[PDB]
Amino acid sequence: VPVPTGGDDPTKVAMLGLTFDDVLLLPAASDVVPATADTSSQLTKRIRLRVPLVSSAMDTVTESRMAIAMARAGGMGVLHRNLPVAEQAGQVETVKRSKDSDGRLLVGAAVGVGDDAWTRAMTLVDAGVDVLIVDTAHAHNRGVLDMVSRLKQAVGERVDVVGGNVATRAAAAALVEAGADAVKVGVGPGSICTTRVVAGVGAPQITAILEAVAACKPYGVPVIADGGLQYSGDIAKALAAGASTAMLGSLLAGTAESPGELIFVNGKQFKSYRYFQDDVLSEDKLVPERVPFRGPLGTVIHQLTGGLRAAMGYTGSATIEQLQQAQFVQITAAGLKE
Amino acid sequence: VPVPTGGDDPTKVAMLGLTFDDVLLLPAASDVVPATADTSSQLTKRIRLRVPLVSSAMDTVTESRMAIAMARAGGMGVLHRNLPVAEQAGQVETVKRSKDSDGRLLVGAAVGVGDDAWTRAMTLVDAGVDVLIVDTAHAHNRGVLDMVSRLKQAVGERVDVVGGNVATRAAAAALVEAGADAVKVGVGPGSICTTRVVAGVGAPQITAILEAVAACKPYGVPVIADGGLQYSGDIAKALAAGASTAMLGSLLAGTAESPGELIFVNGKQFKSYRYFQDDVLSEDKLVPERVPFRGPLGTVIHQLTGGLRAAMGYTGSATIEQLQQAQFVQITAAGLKE
Amino acid sequence: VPVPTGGDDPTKVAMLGLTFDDVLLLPAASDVVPATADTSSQLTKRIRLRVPLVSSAMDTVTESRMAIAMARAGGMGVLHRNLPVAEQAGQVETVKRSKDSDGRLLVGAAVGVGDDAWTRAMTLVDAGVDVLIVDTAHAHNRGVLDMVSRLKQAVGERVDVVGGNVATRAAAAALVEAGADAVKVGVGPGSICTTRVVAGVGAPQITAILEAVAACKPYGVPVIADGGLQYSGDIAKALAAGASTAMLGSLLAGTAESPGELIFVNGKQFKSYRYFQDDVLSEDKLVPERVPFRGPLGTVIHQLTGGLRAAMGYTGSATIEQLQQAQFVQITAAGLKE
Amino acid sequence: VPVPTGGDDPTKVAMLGLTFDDVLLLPAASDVVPATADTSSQLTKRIRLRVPLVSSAMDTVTESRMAIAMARAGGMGVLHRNLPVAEQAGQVETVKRSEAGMVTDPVTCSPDNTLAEVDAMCARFRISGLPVVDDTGELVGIITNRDMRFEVDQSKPVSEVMTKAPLITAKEGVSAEAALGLLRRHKIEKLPIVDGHGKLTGLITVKDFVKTEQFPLSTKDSDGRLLVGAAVGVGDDAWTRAMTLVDAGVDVLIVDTAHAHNRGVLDMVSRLKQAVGERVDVVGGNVATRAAAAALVEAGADAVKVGVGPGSICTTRVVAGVGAPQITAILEAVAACKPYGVPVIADGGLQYSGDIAKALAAGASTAMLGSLLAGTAESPGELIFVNGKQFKSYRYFQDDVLSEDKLVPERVPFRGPLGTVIHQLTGGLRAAMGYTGSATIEQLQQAQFVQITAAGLKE
Amino acid sequence: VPVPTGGDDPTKVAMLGLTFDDVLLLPAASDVVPATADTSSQLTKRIRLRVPLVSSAMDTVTESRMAIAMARAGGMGVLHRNLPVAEQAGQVETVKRSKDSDGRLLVGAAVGVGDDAWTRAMTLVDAGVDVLIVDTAHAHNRGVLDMVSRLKQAVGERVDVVGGNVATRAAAAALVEAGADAVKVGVGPGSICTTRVVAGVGAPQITAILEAVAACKPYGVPVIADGGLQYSGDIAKALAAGASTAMLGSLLAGTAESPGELIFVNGKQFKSYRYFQDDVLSEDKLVPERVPFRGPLGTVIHQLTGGLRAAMGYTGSATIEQLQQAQFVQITAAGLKE
Ligand SMILES: Nc1ncnc2c1ncn2[C@@H]1O[C@H](COP(=O)(O)OP(=O)(O)OP(=O)(O)O)[C@@H](O)[C@H]1O
Ligand SMILES: Nc1ncnc2c1ncn2[C@@H]1O[C@H](COP(=O)(O)OP(=O)(O)OP(=O)(O)O)[C@@H](O)[C@H]1O
Ligand SMILES: [Mg+2]
Ligand SMILES: [Mg+2]
């Protein structure tokens, strides 16, 4: 009668979470050449990218240079918000003035929650931003939903609103009901993540994507998988799990197009570089208190796209929409043994 | 027809035991700001702590200085019994004379089993102790239950009695029947624990807490999770599994407030410091035959409480009683790989 | 409709095998003191040992000195058969002439299969051996069963016949039907075992013990667990899984009483020391082609017995027969992480 | 309502994949002595090997030398295709003429050839003599070691130094005893055998029997020549290569692709089966599912090769996120192939001989040996000595779009003689057969597994 | 009577060679600020450099880009000769067309020995080279001396001729007699040098510089110290030992201005890139058969010049000619112990 893992509530342990290392893509009937596979996918309800990759809105990853490079590569970049409002609008305009209906490069920008966030969002919309991402560590919060709904009513006709990071079906459904044009998924997805170690909170990314897609797919809301990626195979797995686009963080932190200046210390090359880190539950609030150079962004994007095209050829997926129907095989611990 | 793991008895392998590394807290709908979360919790049926942390009754962890520091920090300390009765009463008197209804600092003390244990307990009650903990390696023994019942009849009106370490539902129910005001839970909870290696005996802490809470929650008896803690996330997980307080042992062993004198050896700082170790089945009876300095207690308590508050914010738990209703996701082996 | 692990045969993967590290002994209601716990157990149908430990019949573990020491320690030893028949009979006589009904020390000897094995067995029986072990790598063989039956018919009135190593219920049942006085269990029980790597053959020892006990318990035939032990906790787990005695191998190879001479090489102490290795499927046939000193036997035996007594105190087992009814908790991979 | 691993689709996570390290072979009732066990197994429907081991068609593993050594050991080798069609056909011809037997049609050179060419031919075919025939096929001479041992000018034409006709020759169908009598009487070592006109037909020497004594386990056709296989791709260049290999006398054609569940691979298999099915056997490329194996069987493949990302740290898994654990893949493919009698070749994922035993017990009929053979002496490459260790030292034809080299942006250690590795693998297999009571490989395919946990793998 | 180190010949061990690590510069009376120190020095009899640094003529160090950078930095570069004559002439033209009396950048080029070397030299002089270096591993050879004499007679009025690597006073005197405008010093100068290990040939660099200066200083012939340099302090020591310029080899191999393309492999950055290596006794003839990135040349040059200026300040040397009069202190083995 009692639960095999202890207690009496069978829902106390709600689910078994699978990560990227837990699953592999099963080969299927294929007439798809990797070179001829269409990797385009929807970022939001109204925006389609040639390459389903978006740079994360992290101070160490995306500012104007990275946003321009990502837009030229066929993806997009979200400008980080650890800077003043006027500076963010200036970076938005730097990206725009350098594709949309008018032929200018697409760009996204991150905003928080609050009246200061409202002013920031209005200024960014004035500067010509295309995507507003209400970015929070935990989006299953009434304030985040209120901000998403308010932005959707105010500037929904001209810009797309993306909701904060969720990890469950209920949170994704709440964001969809708030009117979000895309749902960003992932709450402590890394295995050694600071959220997992310090707060004990996390969700393995494959299960989180599956649940959020179960919430969002009926309403046509794209899913952006954010965090937990280590290799291009993880990009393929995230897209096959149901996500429409992937967000790239630490994989792009040390690239040349990312912020920071090149320095040479101890024989190795590095990139050397608060009132705006207003987000509670963020990893910087958990810690008690030099990112290496990674080369040009083009090589990293080429490697990731090559891995994705290889997966598409193996699974017989002509489009990303077909790759989202691919099947997984769950591997055991011996499958991770070197 | 036969059991898949061998034999014919399906109850031979009773359960799959989960440890802290097996589970993560699932994010849920939240309106809780981490700073405004109420971390107050019940130590016993009549005692509520501002911070649900109790320093373990270990010779290397808690004496008068540590007890005073823990009571001032909002938690409590239990004085170890690896010393003469007069010395323990003196430490109790030191803690009291430096909060109860009188306004003196709250303090607990560990007692054993036997006539000498009765003498020790009566002396400690005379000295003004608030909590008596019958601290045994294996509390599911008739002697421990009889001692708990005797203390409850004798001095139960003025002090609280907490039963020793249990790991199963039946043992916790037996302790509740004997009249224990709180149940301490954990028997070989660490992975590389000496009890697990030398004796082959142990119980994973999450499952043990779930079973003990299933036994204790209907009667309103608090559960103290003792052992297996490595990070503040483990504190959050233990409280979410249903425990009311977490007992801190080796994490406080090298703190400045812990016993021992500070010494400087080989450029590193350590702390340098039987007839009273009368408990059989204790880990010292299993071994054939220098604790590093860990800084001030305040920093450790602050970090642990910050992790707890972050978990409460992620789970939407305004109180510890709400955190006790939080759900878990079970992660695979791949989720622990670096 | 197909099996989740592949194919359409649900019995292709017969079972999930558990090893010692997969399980722990659960605590239970206990009035047992480790010092007053009775560790006696049946070695065979007619032989009871004070300490349930038998030194393995390995060339590097047991000859006359080790057999004498084991008999004096309360257990027994089995003399290895990697030597001439007259020499083995001389070792038997050396052990006997230094307990049975006549006051001489009990001793066992290993024999193979064949006519030379029959001559060896008759010589050993004439020398006064008490137990004959028909030691084979794979006892589920018609020749081994015939040898066991022949020995039981010929000399079963005076000496006990123990069957070779088995790993399944069917093999143990075949040995029992052949008249074995005890059944030795374990076939590639170690994780990095040569049989597992080279032949791909093995059986996790806890599951193997459970299956062989399911075969042997209804007929009162004791089970000797051989191999896979690393710690005294493994002794406790094996005896709780249903085995009556544990056979000690590598744990005794480098003891002072074990064969070989003491040498001092590179600052460390070591021991320095075929036509008679006629057994097929033995590990020495699978390999392409200095055992350290381990101290006195008494220390090892004392430590193992202390661990066993601690387990008996935790489980509330006054006797080994009561320990054989104890329950297990299965632990996850995270339970093994250091 | 929801799936325990997430979502609402119960088939999204189709299965739990078991690798070799997940399973052990359970001992069973056994009267099998390891030495007396029969390790013979079917490579294809018509071909049976004495040892169920095939060398992988890898450029670092199998060339003519490796193919000859594998055939002599009782297995077989598949020649890699990362080289021109002419070179691969030449390797096929080298393997076929290593142990010709029967007719033993002797390699012949024209009188217009040179000493360098005949030295190259002698090195190629491991022979010490060549008959010399004219444009019409009539004999004009013979060249041997005694004719050119110290000759200085390698440009010397064959006609200049050959032993001039007439020579000591016999007629077609001459008895073996008569040939031995001629060889003893004239003390010539290589006796030509001529037709009824004057055109050379054969050459008689007992050494072909002697080599039969040397390697009693050699796998051969009815003609007495060593069996050999060759890999082909898909396309028109692949069709030309396959026709050239069939002309050279190849025995097995393997449509070698990383992903055989593809209409091109199936069409190539069907075309080869229709065109040259009576002469050679066609083996389908790598599959990892029951449906792909069923498609290959429907295409007419004589054997199905199984494995797609089988290794744990395989490049395909890391870069593409694609793979299938090998034990589950073999079980799934055998579930489709066994009802039709189609053998399964397990390719990839092997690290120890126990894995070979497990792969055969899972239902596969042969194991294909790859990286375990890459560094052996019989493998292509030249030995070099660097530091304190010995290593092996040494695209247009890498046309597979899903091959791992397309994923990787970019020394091979020495492993000793092939015979030692083959002996160790066979010993492990025989021990497994003894433990499981399997007298034959077909009985071993019925053996049961026990699944082990993570704790069973910890050192 | 006999030699204390063996034998009867007292000149069998000719000298005790001092390396850079053997000596330190003694501080002296100083009115010299490092900022105002004049580091200009004579490269040859007729060429003066602002910074006494010459880039080594190795295939991995100096071609047109490195030569241009070195000329702009105040030093000079020598073009390597592991390439066809036309290509080296093209590189000379690239350097010249991008300082001499006509305002073009100065550049030097290495030549070998033989008739093809003469053709190469004539082509290079036609292309407008300023310095010809007859670069050989062992310049105390009649062929090198004859080549130097022929070049001096032919094109001595327009270009400066530098002799190959010597290590003794006699070799330097022979080069001066032959008409070398500068003498390059060093033969197996490194401690782990291939020439020393394979051939047993070498000369510690401080002693070699002192002897060559003893040969060259009365004739006003500058000395170029080539090889053995590890730090800027070694540059200061070499200049103080009497050398006029220092040739930089492996220190400049991985710099951006050096030949090769940048590649990023395994998280680290490297530079990736015979009939023309005709010189016998070169280290490629002795070896049986990726250079890391080192940052911009400017950082290396700035650091080396800063160290040189610090030494000039410590010794009170207003000019390099005054630094050439500085004194050394010999240090023991304990002075090298970390
Ligand atoms: N031209 C050929 N074509 C095919 N097979 C050949 C040819 N020449 C020889 N063989 C085969 O290979 C074997 C090689 O022996 P061959 O006589 O050429 O060598 P050998 O060095 O003269 O031998 P030995 O001196 O030891 O008798 C022959 O006995 C025959 O079986
Ligand atoms: N059938 C033959 N009839 C006549 N002469 C022959 C015949 N075969 C070979 N010869 C000649 O006899 C001589 C020796 O040839 P033979 O075949 O004995 O040498 P081989 O096999 O190379 O022997 P070895 O191993 O001693 O070098 C040569 O001059 C050769 O041309
Ligand atoms: Mg010969
Ligand atoms: Mg011969």
Side-chain angles (χ1 to χ4, degrees), chain B residues 118-135:
Chain B
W118 187 258
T119 298
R120 188 180 287 269
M122 296 309 278
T123 310
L124 295 167
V125 172
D126 285 328
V129 80
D130 305 276
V131 186
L132 277 174
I133 304 210
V134 185
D135 202 15

Side-chain angles (χ1 to χ4, degrees), chain B residues 30-75:
Chain B
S30 183
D31 302 310
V32 173
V33 173
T36 69
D38 180 20
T39 61
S40 71
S41 188
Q42 300 287 167
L43 175 63
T44 58
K45 279 197 172 188
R46 296 146 71 198
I47 288 165
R48 198 174 182 82
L49 306 181
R50 287 178 281 163
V51 177
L53 293 182
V54 176
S55 77
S56 178
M58 328 190 5
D59 70 319
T60 55
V61 179
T62 313
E63 32 196 58
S64 184
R65 183 178 175 187
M66 169 62 77
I68 289 157
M70 285 297 299
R72 283 172 177 172

Side-chain angles (χ1 to χ4, degrees), chain A residues 278-295:
Chain A
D278 51 3
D279 187 23
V280 299
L281 301 171
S282 68
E283 286 188 315
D284 48 296
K285 316 300 177 175
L286 304 179
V287 291
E289 159 75 322
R290 303 199 310 275
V291 53
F293 184 54
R294 297 170 84 98

Side-chain angles (χ1 to χ4, degrees), chain D residues 128-129 142-147 149 162-163 166-169 187-192:
Chain D
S128 308
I142 198 150
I143 276 189
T144 189
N145 183 32
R146 306 259 181 88
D147 299 308
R149 182 141 44 193
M162 68 187 187
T163 293
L167 302 119
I168 297 296
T169 57
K187 295 170 286 282
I188 60 100
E189 294 191 45
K190 278 147 309 191
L191 179 63

